[PDB]
Amino acid sequence: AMEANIFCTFDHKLSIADVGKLTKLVAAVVPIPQRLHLIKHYQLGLHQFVDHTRGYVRLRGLLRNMTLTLMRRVEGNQILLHVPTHGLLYTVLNTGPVTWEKGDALCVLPPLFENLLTLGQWELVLPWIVPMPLALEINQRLLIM
Amino acid sequence: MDARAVAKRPRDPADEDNELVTALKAKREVNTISVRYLYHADHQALTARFFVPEGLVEFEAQPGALLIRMETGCDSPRHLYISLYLLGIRASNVSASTRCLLESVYTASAARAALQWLDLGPHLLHRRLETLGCVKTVSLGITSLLTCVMRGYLYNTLKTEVFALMIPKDMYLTWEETRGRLQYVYLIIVYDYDGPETRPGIYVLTSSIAHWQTLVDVARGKFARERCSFVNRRITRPRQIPLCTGVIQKLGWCLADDIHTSFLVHKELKLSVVRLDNFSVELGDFREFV
Amino acid sequence: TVSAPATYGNFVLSPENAVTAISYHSILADFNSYKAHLTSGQPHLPNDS
Amino acid sequence: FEAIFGTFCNRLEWVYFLTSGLAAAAHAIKFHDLNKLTTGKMLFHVQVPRVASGAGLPTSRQTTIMVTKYSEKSPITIPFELSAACLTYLRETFEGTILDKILNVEAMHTVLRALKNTADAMERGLIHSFLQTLLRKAPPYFVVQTL
Amino acid sequence: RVASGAGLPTSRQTTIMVTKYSEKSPITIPFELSAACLTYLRETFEGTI
């Protein structure tokens, strides 16, 4: 019997190198705009929101509303994404710039800074996973700056 | 999909044979390892394993101790794992005799190091602490191993015994005459802004209130003097920028009838505690109030 | 007195090896043995090429 | 072209406690209720011989000596790991194509290899624990020869 | 692996995979013949001893 999952289909042709790149990310946190059963690859990541005249705080506001999900399995023609539920344990990848410790409380932030899956005009922009005090420090420093 | 597929009620997790039995049956091969029953396979509680030096493990040999993570302000150990009892030393709420007793208990280099690190920096206490959960195991040694639950009940391997949560009697706090049937338990740290330095009070509160605003209104009623001290320091001592008068963290829920009084014995010394018999942990973060 | 091989051994590539050499520049010796053991379910081949 | 001349795997060799000559020092017994046992002990009763003394000397009174010996416990452990990919393909059949059969076979062989490796490790660990206990109780040559 | 005592660190499962490659070294030797030798090998003149 299967677990419940969300299917993502890439609307672009993928080489073996691209799918080999994807399977490296088999536990990364991917934000998704809506809880929907089948989605197209454009909806993945933060690239859909990127703008020239807007910056960090609007991205923070948008990330508040997005649905977080974990990439579960990579296959030809499709990707399996699992939406976590409250109170259960999961494996996540430290894509952030900072090492973690046991007992840390993590929060998600827009990325500030290797590139992943450069398709014709779309990129897989994953968010930052950071311990809470660092996020507070970053917010205050940026606001003062 | 078909009608029989929809009608079919789900498989019982207990009547299906596990993966290892499945493989052995598939090959029809024997193995020395007993495999028919997997232990902890039906524990819904979430647990973690923590290493801690010999000096710090005292009164945490018995299950039910609350486990905190403290910051050292250093790179060599980075973090240490301490119990609520050790924080009993620093708290002003604890009485003199109990302070002397559990100060005589923790006469080890590691515990004294923890106290020096706690008092050394300029930060408030709650910024240096992170709560992990309740412990239920011990394997003693020069470095001891503790397993702590962070979501669930406290019980041993077969659930043949459920463990309580132990709170020292000076830290226990109630604000209602007749208890509600369901009780939530909170951790409170409150700062008194006297002249020389802040003296922190540490409490564990059992309450029927789940709403944040009502609870904080009751707390502000109970801690008026400390709020007055906060404002007084703000007036008399500029360029000192205090934050907060207290923080409140939620951790757990238990039934009112499970609450009992008891004592703990360690090296033929008796410490008196409040005992929450069927406590189950549910951690929150520190929310601050003024 | 000791028994020794009287002549050299001979190694020959299969037509499947010819197809794989043309298409992928690669050869897997005893390709058919690998195929048969993989589809049958045995993990171990009897000997190397 | 490039050529691959065979693929080889480690033919691991198996070790058993009862086959080792170190087992000669042991008297191995299996006991299913051992986990419930707290402590075990044996008790000894000794009465000493004595010799009649002559006139003017103190006589040796008869004496009996009781001693008891206790058992010590030393559990051993080792983990093994399975991946979620192994677990899903162990008990699932997607359309039953030959690739799916290959993956099912691979999951089954993975878990079987893990079980065999862990059983061998348990045998080796038993030998290791017994040897450590023997070394712990054994004094050096100069002590015993002086005695 | 060897099972460890309680409290000691345990041994993780480890898979090691290794590849090994071949080498090449050819050999050669010449021999030579004279023009007269080839002439008398290929053709014959008025038959005589």
Three-state secondary structure readout of B156-201: CCCCCCECCEEEEHHHEEECCCCCCCEEEEEEEEEEECCCCCCEEE
Distance CA A71, CA A41 (A): 13
Query: Does the CB of E49 have a partner CB in chain B at under 8 Å?
Result: no
- What count of other Cβ atoms lies within 10 Å of the Cβ of residue B163? 21
Query: E7 contacts in B (CB within 8 Å)?
Result: 139, 141, 145
Give the separation between CA C31 and CA C38, rounded to whole angstroms: 11
CA–CA distance, A36 with A12 (Å, rounded to integer): 20
Residue B11 at interface with chain A, using a CB cutoff of 8 Å: yes
- Continuous segment of H or E residues that includes residue D66: strand D64-70
C-alpha angle A69-A75-A80 in degrees, rounded to nearest 5: 20
> Which tokens sit at A48?
């859909």
Q: Provide the β-strand partners of residue B272.
A: B263
Strand segments (E) across C1-49: 26-28
Q: Angle B224-236/B212-222 helices, nearest 10 degrees?
A: 80
B133-158 as b/e: b if 16+ CB within 10 A: bbbbebeeeeebbbebbbbbbbbeee
Q: Which residues of A touch B132 (CB under 8 A)?
A: 103
Q: Tell the burial category of B162 from Cβ atoms under 10 Å away from its Cβ (0-12, 13-18, 19+).
A: middle
Method: cryo-EM
List the one residue out of D48, D49, D47, D46 whose CA is nearest residue D68.
D46
Query: Could you tell me which residues of chain E have a Cβ less than 8 Å from any Cβ in chain D?
Result: 1-6, 10-11, 13
Q: What residue of E is the nearest CA neighbor of B51?
A: E7
Query: B4: buried, middle or exposed (CB in 10 Å: 19+, 13-18, 0-12)?
Result: exposed
Look up residue D11 and give its amino acid: R
State the Cα–Cα distance between residues B127 and B200, nearest whole angstrom. Answer: 13
CA distance D69 to A106: 55
Using CA atoms, how far apart are residues B186 and B183, in angstroms rounded to an integer? 10
Task: Tell me the C-alpha distance between B64 and B60, whole Å.
Answer: 8
Report DSSP state, residue B74.
Answer: S
**Cβ–Cβ gap E3/D124 under 8 Å:** yes
AA identity, residue B190: V
Residues on chain B touching A104 (C-beta within 8 angstroms): 130
User: Do residues B99 and B88 touch, judged by C-beta distance below 8 A?
Assistant: yes
- Please choose, from the candidates A78, A86, A90, the residue with its C-alpha nearest in 3D space to the C-alpha of residue A44: A78
Q: Which of residues 7-46 of D touch B (CB under 8 A)?
A: none
Distance (Å, whole) CA C20 – CA C23: 5
End-to-end Cα separation, chain A, in angstroms: 53
Query: Considering only residues 138 to 177 of chain B, which have any Cβ-Cβ distance to chain D shorter than 8 Å?
Result: none
